[PDB]
Structure 1
Amino acid sequence: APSPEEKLHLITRNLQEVLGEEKLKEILKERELKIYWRTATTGKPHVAYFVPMSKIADFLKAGCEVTILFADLHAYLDNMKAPWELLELRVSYYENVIKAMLESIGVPLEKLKFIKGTDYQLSKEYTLDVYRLSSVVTQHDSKKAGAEVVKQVEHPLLSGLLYPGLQALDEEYLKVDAQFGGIDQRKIFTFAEKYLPALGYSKRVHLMNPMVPGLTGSKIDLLDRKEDVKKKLKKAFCEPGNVENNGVLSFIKHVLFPLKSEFVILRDEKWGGNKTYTAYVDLEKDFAAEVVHPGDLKNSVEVALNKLLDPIREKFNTPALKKLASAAYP
């Protein structure tokens, strides 16, 4: 059972920024932290999705209650021509792939909750709060808050101005202590800290991951065959000695290293043989020194990534999920 300090470390490791450390520590002295993470359901998740998922896994390992919101209302509003059933098929795909990813990482799911936006974002009390918020929030602040998150468009739509407030109110309605997301959500998060108190609701802790450079880029799909994973990785950019901007090193730092707090580099005996790193900074140092070659770095990632993907591919080859995957993406 982790101490409050150990929980804090699991929760905050690899994050770019934490807002609300004071409250975060107060909570962890007494009880488990409750965390909300929002995901859109419009795309098709590729391996980059393991970056947020690795933090979700840390949260669960630390004993947190984690609520994942599947933003099905927004998915509908962003293309109302699409039928509610294909949209919900994609919601189901996301729910199942998230479960499979976390099972593969190896964390307890008892305190993981899935909720759909449509479950409550059209409810009476929530809607009244959306209106209350609209009566205190200036159009200027609404626009500013979504500047990095809302699609930049020809003539901006009214919906974009409403989105920051819905995401803030989610924190209250999901009854959480904190919201996690990427640092690109910072203005949405500061908006929530400013305006929730206007409605008599507490500001929340905010946990922000960095915007991590992609492993490749086509992209490696979560269900790509091992053959295609290999081929796509072979094409990945990875400059020798380059530690500042390196998608391969980033994937190790944020996804692979955290699994067991180690990473094995596969290397020919000629160049020193395999080495097991127990701190990421040690791997960074060797890569900068050019004694871990890009090809060996990529081979090491390929092996570990395929291990991570194996059980997911297995599960999605069952009749029910095989059908789901192809239907969700006809």
Structure 2
Amino acid sequence: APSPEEKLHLITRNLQEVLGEEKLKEILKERELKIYWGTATTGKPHVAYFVPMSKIADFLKAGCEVTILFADLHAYLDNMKAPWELLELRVSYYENVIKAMLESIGVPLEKLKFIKGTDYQLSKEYTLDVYRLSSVVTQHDSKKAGAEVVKQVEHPLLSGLLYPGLQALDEEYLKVDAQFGGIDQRKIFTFAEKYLPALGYSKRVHLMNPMVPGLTGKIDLLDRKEDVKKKLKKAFCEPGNVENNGVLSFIKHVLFPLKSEFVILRDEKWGGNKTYTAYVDLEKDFAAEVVHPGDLKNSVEVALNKLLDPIREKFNTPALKKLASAAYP
């Protein structure tokens, strides 16, 4: 144990869609799945990142060989969401904060592989494949593949058209069996399944998380407890409304996978604390309005601060404080 079935459950739970179930099961019957998740080194990571980090935790529990890609070249190709000089600083910021999040949720880092895009995306072999891919990929398909990912501007830049192709090639160069990302990556994922074979490379399994609403409808990973409270003070959390609820979503995608349970802090007057072992049970109580928005938020606030504490402490140094400012002037 875990059995192939148990691994499949851990790997696919909470996902919106799985592409390649046949191959996925063939792999799990014999060996560990090789999978990666990529993130362009753009904006400062916020609490929403705990969502993909939770799936990464699931992959490791399932015995997967996991790689995290810091896509610095992609950040540059996406309408320069980060200058080339600041890219290296942002890669550092991302590496430090992502590792901090993983340590916070108790994910062993000794087995995770961290890689930067420019570590191999400028190599001759990779570049040759970019040109080979460009010879078969139509301008049309490239533009369509990145519609929901690359910033759409009035006068589209050539860089935006290259973006999808490099993400596809990353699957082969990182030597993975699968790629995990949000459902917003779907068009790039299908693009990769169609074109990698054209270059003699295998199509990969694709795991897609749903687009989860945020807690603030953003809470920075380094925000002080005071700001966390203030930002939570809002958040779309209407009584009895279980849809488009960022607070419930955070519990479903982050807290339950982490602790396997969720405790609602509630006054004795209204029933006292209650421990839920399944998200569906909590949702039922929220819909019945026996779990008040204020108590739901307070319960998440306590749990979130527990996740952020070690992170805020880690970055409480002159060096890291300097990096944060340098990476984001």
Same fold? TM cut 0.5: yes
Query: Which stretch of the first structure deviates more once superposed, 281-290 or 22-31?
Result: 22-31
Deviations 1:55-93, CA, capped at 9 Å, x for gaps: 111112221111111111123345669664422111100
- Contact between 2:216 and 2:234, CA under 8 Å: does it hold in 1? yes
Separation in structure 2 between the aligned mates of residue 140 and residue 76 of structure 1, nearest angstrom: 22
Structure 2 distance, partners of 1:274, 1:92, is 41
**Residues of 1 paired with 2:69 and 2:98: CA distance?**
12
Q: How far off is 1:116 after superposition?
A: 1.0
Q: Per the alignment, do residues 212 and 313 of structure 1 end up closer, same or farther by CA in structure 2, a change over 3 Å counting? A: same
Query: After alignment, is 278-287 or 62-71 more displaced?
Result: 62-71
* Count of aligned positions: 329
CA contact (8 A) 1:60 1:109 kept: no
Question: Does the 8 Å CA contact 2:143/2:161 hold for their aligned counterparts?
Answer: yes
Cα deviation 1:20-60 (Å, max 9, x = unaligned): 01111111111111111110111011111111111111112
Determine if contact 2:264/2:296 at 8 Å carries over to the other structure: yes
Q: Distance in 1 between matches of 2:85 and 2:7?
A: 40
Task: Give the distance between the partners of 1:66 and 1:182, measured in 2 at CA.
Answer: 17
Secondary structure of 1:214 counterpart:
coil
1:277 equivalent in structure 2? 276
Q: Distance in 2 between matches of 1:327 and 1:164?
A: 29
Sort the Cα spacing of 1:79 and 1:61 in 2 relative to 1 into closer, same or farther, 3 A.
same
The 1-side partners of 2:194 and 2:210 are apart by: 22
> What's the offset of the Cα at 1:260?
1.6
Secondary structure, aligned partner of 2:30? coil
In structure 1, distance between residues paired with 2:263 and 2:234: 21
Q: Partners of 1:179 and 1:226 in 2: how far apart?
A: 35
Q: Counterpart in 2 of 1:252?
A: 251
Instruction: Quote the offset at 1:252 in angstroms.
Output: 0.5
TM superposition shift of 1:111: 2.2
Specify whether residues 81 and 229 from structure 1 end up closer, same or farther in structure 2 by C-alpha distance, changes over 3 A only.
closer
The structural deviation recorded for 1:5 is 1.3
Q: Deviations over 1:131-159 (max 9, x none)?
A: 11111112211111111112111111111
Q: Deviations over 1:267-291 (max 9, x none)?
A: 0011100000000000000000000
* Structure 1 residues 41-52: aligned runs within 5 Å: 41-52=41-52
Distance 1:57 1:253 in 2: 15
Contact 2:78 2:159 in 1 (8 A): no
Q: Deviations over 1:147-206 (max 9, x none)?
A: 111211111111111111111110000000000000000010001001111111100000
1:13 corresponds to which residue? 13
Rounded to whole Å, the distance in 1 between the matches of 2:91 and 2:37 is: 15
How far 1:326 sits from its partner (Å)? Answer: 2.3
Separation of aligned partners in 2, 1:43 and 1:107: 23
Question: Which deviates the most, 146-155 or 259-268?
Answer: 146-155
Normalised by the length of structure 1, the TM-score is 0.96
Secondary structure of residue in 1 paired with 2:66? strand
Residues 246-269 of structure 1: CA distance to partner in whole angstroms, max 9, x if unpaired? 011001001111112100000001
Whole-angstrom distance in 2 between the partners of 1:201 and 1:45: 32
Contact 2:77 2:163 (C-alpha < 8 Å) held by counterparts: no
Residue matched to 1:58: 58
Q: Give the C-alpha shift of residue 318 in structure 1.
A: 2.7
Alignment CA distance shift 1:256-1:211 (3 Å): same
1:319 positional shift:
3.1
SS at match of 1:29: helix
Q: Is the 8 A contact 1:64 1:111 kept in 2?
A: no
**Normalised TM-score (structure 2):** 0.97
* RMSD of aligned residue pairs (Cα, Å): 1.4
